[PDB]
């Protein structure tokens, strides 16, 4: 994917054509006159005399100075820029290679896992593996489960049906489990609760109480 | 032209100078594209559109006020368009490109290009009506899926069991909101009809976006009102100047002028660069609201509200986003005698 | 080749580029000028016998007539004719309003003392010209034809003449701690003092003759104007204006600017004069400065093809050859101009892209939700930019998806994080 | 009174230049007023005592 794509470290290379951009352009400012008889102090001093050369000096002074402010300037603008993307690189690493982020599309799209560094010519590439859910599946859900008069909520999970009896999965993969009372935690009767539904949730000490 | 208009002996003189007027439109072009790239990364999050909720029926929340209004000549959400009227060009000084800056008015015009004095305003390239489409498409993927849309392919699920879970985020138990679905319900309506009345009846409410406004024409007025300056020559217009003096001593004049306007122009073009830079920074961080708080639900305390963050929601605004927080606040306290352990036998 | 140009280099990668304006903006002119018809009265201003001296310089006003300065510009009987402020080539085209014309007669070495912003005995006692001056001041030799105590001056004045000011009081001036009794001591002496000009005397005393014209401007609509011929005014065209000496370069269209009766001239904020009164006519004519400049060609790159689609920023579509001034243009820009690929996006009118109706993402942004690409025979094509994929999550309560299976995506994220330290020895 | 410190006829060629004067001030002052908001920003977090 690095190499196919052409411009896959275009914001790497911006920097080196922006420097080199700037610093071209600093020296071809030393060909214009800025008004003066020549762009050239040598041909000003062996063809005037002090008094009359002094103003064209002045005026070549004038304009390289100008020259040299925009350069600084301009630099100083794109140095601020640099440091905030290098913050924001310091940031990606520490909390995304050291660590694992539960910040939304922080370090990739998907469930943050891990990342992993890698040095490029002026900055950093992260190489972020996430974890993206796949083979979507329609069930039948409902809020609470209601027993023998008692309301049944997941305790860390999901009620769902695949036609015609319930299980508790988790939200994030579908691993069917019987519901039963270490599954589901009871949080009154059922008459509050909007859509809850009839089933049994069967206790895992009947059977050992029974022989 | 700003400098130079369409004078040939001005242009002549101004060639002398380098390629500063290059440097200045390199400058501008940058900031134009970058201005771009923020509305790109702010709103173009999640590139699938999906279609605004035809079932009107949220287990209680009813979502009007923020949902796309039909009956409308732009597909605007009453908050959105209640918005769109708070950041006002009245008081702004180049308001002067309401000439209808599409292809003139009147007869020919050519306002926006040579009917000022150089000064453009390029058009963005996300118009508004796609913006509000792209919001309403995160407004209807939260709905549906919830934060399942931000990180792979959208699972449905209903409202009230995706609010059980933004519940479960927060420390607090499924049950507490499945049984107090309906005074949820009733307090989320209420509290976005609160937001609605407070939008439309305090008059500063959009202050952040319109003081963006008023530094940008008061930053161009102050651009057009150097161009009556003299910085010193016998006059501020080059054409009086031409037509009075011979070209020997008209080049003393016009240098002063052009130096006197150049300086202007890099003025403008430096303080629009750091506006642009802090813009930039603004940008960023609601690109990072919309990503951390939109598509998903965020455990940074006071980055997405006063309160346990529950969920929010996008509105486009004239330049800005604006983002309703929708947060779970404890009241009513109670104080009760506790211990750290209980010693059985 | 304007935008190949515009970056310096004969290569041109995809995009959008704005393109500096080389092409011939001037074409010919009009003169529009005032009614007047009547030679001034310059004649008795350097054929009078009588030239009142320094002290008592004659002032007249000259107003509401035309006046060939080239009459005056071209005779040899004057040796200085020295212009401040403008230039006597200029001086015919120029209609200035209420020229005053003052004469006197001096010395050979008081000649240099009339010119702006200098101290002297008559330039600081008799006749002060103002710091800044606009006018001419023309002094030529007449030794052999005045020399005679006729010609007097101002030798003693109190402090000095504030400028353009008259005194000819003849009380004795105070040139000491005493207080001036009233006739001439030893502290008391005449200001009132007469040299006597001899017909052979030397260079420097000499008698020299000198007018000053000072020609007052921005004084409402003008009078003294030179002996322009008012041409026909030409509208919708680029020209060069003279309305009343309002000179410039631009497009005289008819507007529907109220204009009150006495306002003349009319201008925008930026102090630029956006409308005139034509002197014969009453009529407004507001003035559109010629080279447009505001073009963006979008080119698929050189690389790929020499094709290019150009758009013109707020022109509409049907006013492309009128802007731009496409009579003027070489053929090849003429293609550029008019077609059957002209498209009225709200960026502008583009021309050279035909438009298609499908939606693909933005290759080239050309704005308003327009952008172009070069698709395939080959061309370039202008389209609304697709926002994304169409889907929707059929909403129903009572219902959830699962996923049943996962996949272990690696990103890539690329940040700059230092840029080159560079160090520039200033001296 | 920085550029022409007490001097009418420098001040009034000052005049020739443009907001050049109005512009700095303005940028300063928006600078000044920043600082206020940052230090409310920081500190100024809950308002109760
Ligand atoms: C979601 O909330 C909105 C308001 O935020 C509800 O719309 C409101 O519906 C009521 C009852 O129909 C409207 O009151 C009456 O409407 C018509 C207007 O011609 C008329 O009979 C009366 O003058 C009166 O106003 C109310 O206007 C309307 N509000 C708005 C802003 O349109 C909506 O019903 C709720 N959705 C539900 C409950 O599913
Ligand atoms: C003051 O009086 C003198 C008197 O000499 C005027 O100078 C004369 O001006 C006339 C009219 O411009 C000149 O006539 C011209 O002469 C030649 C003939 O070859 C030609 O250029 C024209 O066809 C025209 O006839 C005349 O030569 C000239 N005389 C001298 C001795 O220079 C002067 O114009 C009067 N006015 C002022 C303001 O000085
Ligand atoms: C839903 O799942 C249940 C539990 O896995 C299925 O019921 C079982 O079906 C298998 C295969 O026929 C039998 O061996 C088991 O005895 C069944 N269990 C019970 C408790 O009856 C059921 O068939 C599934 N339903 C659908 C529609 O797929
Ligand atoms: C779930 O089972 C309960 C058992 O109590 C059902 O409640 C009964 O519903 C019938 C039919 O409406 C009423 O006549 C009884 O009076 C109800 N009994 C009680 C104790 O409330 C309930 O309807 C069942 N749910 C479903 C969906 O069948
Ligand atoms: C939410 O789910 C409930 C489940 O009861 C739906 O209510 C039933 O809908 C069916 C299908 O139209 C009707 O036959 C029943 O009579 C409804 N029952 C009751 C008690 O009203 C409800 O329609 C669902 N919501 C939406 C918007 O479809
Ligand atoms: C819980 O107890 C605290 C004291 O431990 C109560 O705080 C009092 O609040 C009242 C009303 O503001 C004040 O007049 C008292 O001075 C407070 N007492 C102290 C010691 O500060 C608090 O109100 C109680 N909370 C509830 C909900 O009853
Ligand atoms: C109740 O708390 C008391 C006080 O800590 C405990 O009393 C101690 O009991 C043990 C065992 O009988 C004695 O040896 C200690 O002398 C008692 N302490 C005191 C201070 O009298 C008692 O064990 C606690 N009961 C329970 C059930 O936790
Ligand atoms: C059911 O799931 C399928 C994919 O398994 C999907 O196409 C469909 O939209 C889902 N929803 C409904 C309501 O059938
Ligand atoms: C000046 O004369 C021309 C004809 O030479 C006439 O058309 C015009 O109306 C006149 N202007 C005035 C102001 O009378
Ligand atoms: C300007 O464009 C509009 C459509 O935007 C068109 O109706 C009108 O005719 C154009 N103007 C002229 C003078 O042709
Ligand atoms: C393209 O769409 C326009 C409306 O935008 C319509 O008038 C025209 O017929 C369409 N052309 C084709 C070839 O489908």
């Not at chain 1, 305790?155 to 049906?161: A, H, T």
């Not at chain 2, 923020?66 to 702004?92: G, Q």
Request: with cysteine; charged share 15%; net charge neutral.
């Amino acid at each position: 994917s690095l190499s196919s794509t052409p411009s896959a470290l275009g914001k790497l290379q911006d920097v080196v054509n922006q420097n080199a951009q700037a610093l071209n352009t600093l020296v071809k400012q030393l060909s214009s006159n800025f008004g003066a008889i020549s762009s050239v102090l040598n041909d000003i001093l062996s063809r005037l005399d002090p008094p009359e050369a002094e103003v064209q000096i002045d005026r070549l002074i004038t304009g390289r100075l100008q020259s040299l402010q925009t350069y600084v300037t301009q630099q100083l603008i794109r140095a601020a820029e640099i440091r905030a993307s290098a913050n924001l690189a310091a940031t990606k690493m520490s909390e995304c290679v050291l660590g694992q982020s539960k910040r939304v599309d922080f370090c990739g799209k998907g469930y943050h896992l891990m990342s992993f560094p890698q040095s490029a010519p002026h900055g950093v590439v992260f190489l972020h593996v996430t974890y993206v859910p796949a083979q979507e599946k329609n069930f039948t859900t409902a809020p609470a489960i209601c027993h023998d008069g008692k309301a049944h909520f997941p305790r860390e999970g999901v009620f769902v049906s695949n036609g015609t009896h319930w299980f508790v999965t988790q939200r994030n993969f579908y691993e069917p489990q019987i519901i039963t009372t270490d599954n589901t935690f009871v949080s009154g009767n059922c008459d509050v609760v909007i859509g809850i539904v009839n089933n049994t949730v069967y206790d895992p000490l009947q059977p050992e109480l029974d022989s | 032209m700003y400098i130079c208009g369409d004078s040939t002996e001005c242009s002549n003189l101004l060639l002398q100078y380098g390629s500063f007027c290059t440097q200045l439109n390199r400058a501008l072009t940058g900031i134009a594209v970058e201005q771009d790239k923020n509305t790109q990364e702010v709103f173009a999050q999640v590139k699938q559109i999906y279609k605004t909720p035809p079932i009107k029926d949220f287990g209680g929340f009813n979502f009007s006020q923020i949902l796309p209004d039909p009956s409308k000549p732009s597909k605007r959400s009453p908050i959105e368009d209640l918005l769109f009227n708070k950041v006002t060009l009245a008081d702004a000084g180049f308001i002067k490109q309401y000439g209808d800056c599409l292809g003139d008015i009147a007869a020919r015009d050519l306002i926006c290009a040579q009917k000022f004095n150089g000064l453009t305003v390029l058009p963005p390239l996300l118009t508004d009506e796609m913006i509000a489409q792209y919001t309403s498409a995160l407004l209807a993927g939260t709905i549906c899926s919830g934060w399942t849309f931000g990180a792979g392919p959208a699972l449905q699920i209903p409202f009230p069991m995706q609010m059980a879970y933004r519940f479960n985020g927060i420390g607090v138990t499924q049950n507490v909101l499945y049984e107090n679905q309906k005074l949820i319900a009733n307090q989320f309506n209420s509290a976005i009809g609160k937001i609605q009345d407070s939008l439309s009846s305090t008059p500063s409410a959009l202050g952040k976006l319109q003081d963006v406004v008023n530094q940008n024409a008061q930053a161009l007025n102050t651009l057009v009102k150097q161009l009556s300056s003299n910085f010193g020559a016998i006059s501020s217009v080059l054409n009086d100047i031409l037509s009075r003096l011979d070209p020997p001593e008209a080049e003393v004049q016009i240098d002063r002028l052009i130096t006197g306007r150049l300086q202007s122009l890099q003025t403008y073009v430096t303080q629009q660069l750091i506006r642009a830079a802090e813009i930039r920074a603004s940008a960023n961080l609601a690109a990072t609201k919309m990503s951390e708080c939109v598509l998903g639900q965020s455990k940074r305390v006071d980055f997405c509200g006063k309160g346990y963050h529950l969920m929010s929601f996008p509105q486009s605004a004239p330049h800005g986003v604006v983002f309703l927080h929708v947060t779970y606040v404890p009241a009513q306290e109670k104080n009760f005698t506790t211990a750290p352990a209980i010693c059985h036998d | 080749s304007e935008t190949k140009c515009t970056l310096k280099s004969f290569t041109v990668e995809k995009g959008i580029y704005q393109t500096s304006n080389f092409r011939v903006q001037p074409t010919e002119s009009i003169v529009r000028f005032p009614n007047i018809t009547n030679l001034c009265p310059f004649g008795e201003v350097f054929n009078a016998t009588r030239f009142a001296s320094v002290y008592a310089w004659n002032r007249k006003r000259i107003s509401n007539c035309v006046a060939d300065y080239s009459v005056l510009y071209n005779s040899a009987s004057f040796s200085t004719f020295k212009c401040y402020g403008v230039s006597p080539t200029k001086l015919n085209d120029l209609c200035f309003t209420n020229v005053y014309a003052d004469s006197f007669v001096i010395r050979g070495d008081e000649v240099r003392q009339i010119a702006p912003g200098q101290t002297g005995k008559i330039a600081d006692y008799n006749y002060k010209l103002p710091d800044d001056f606009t006018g001419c001041v023309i002094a030529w030799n007449s030794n052999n034809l005045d020399s005679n105590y006729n010609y007097l001056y101002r030798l003693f004045r109190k402090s000095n003449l504030k400028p353009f000011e008259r005194d000819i009081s003849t009380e004795i001036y105070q040139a000491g701690s005493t207080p001036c009794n009233g006739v001439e001591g030893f502290n008391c002496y005449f200001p009132l003092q007469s040299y006597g000009f001899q017909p052979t005397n030397g260079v420097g005393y000499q008698p020299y003759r000198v007018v000053v014209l000072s020609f007052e401007l921005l004084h409402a609509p003008a009078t003294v104007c030179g002996p322009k011929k008012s041409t026909n005014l030409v509208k919708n065209k680029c020209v060069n204006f003279n309305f009343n000496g309002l000179t410039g370069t631009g497009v005289l269209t008819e507007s529907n600017k109220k204009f009150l009766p006495f306002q003349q001239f009319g201008r925008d904020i930026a102090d630029t004069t956006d409308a005139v009164r034509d002197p014969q006519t009453l009529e407004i004519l507001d003035i559109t400065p010629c080279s447009f400049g505001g073009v963006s060609v979008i080119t698929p790159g050189t690389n790929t093809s020499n094709q290019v689609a150009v758009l013109y920023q707020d022109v509409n579509c049907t006013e492309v050859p009128v802007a731009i001034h496409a009579d003027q243009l070489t053929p090849t820009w003429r293609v550029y101009s008019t077609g059957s690929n002209v498209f009225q996006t709200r960026a502008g009118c583009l021309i050279g892209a035909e438009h298609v109706n499908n939606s693909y993402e933005c290759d080239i942004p050309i704005g308003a939700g327009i952008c172009a690409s070069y698709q395939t025979s080959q061309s370039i094509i202008a389209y609304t930019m697709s926002l994304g994929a169409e889907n929707s999550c059929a909403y129903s309560n009572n219902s959830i998806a699962i996923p049943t299976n996962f996949t272990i995506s690696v990103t890539t994220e690329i940040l700059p994080v230092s840029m080159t330290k560079t160090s520039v020895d200033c001296t």
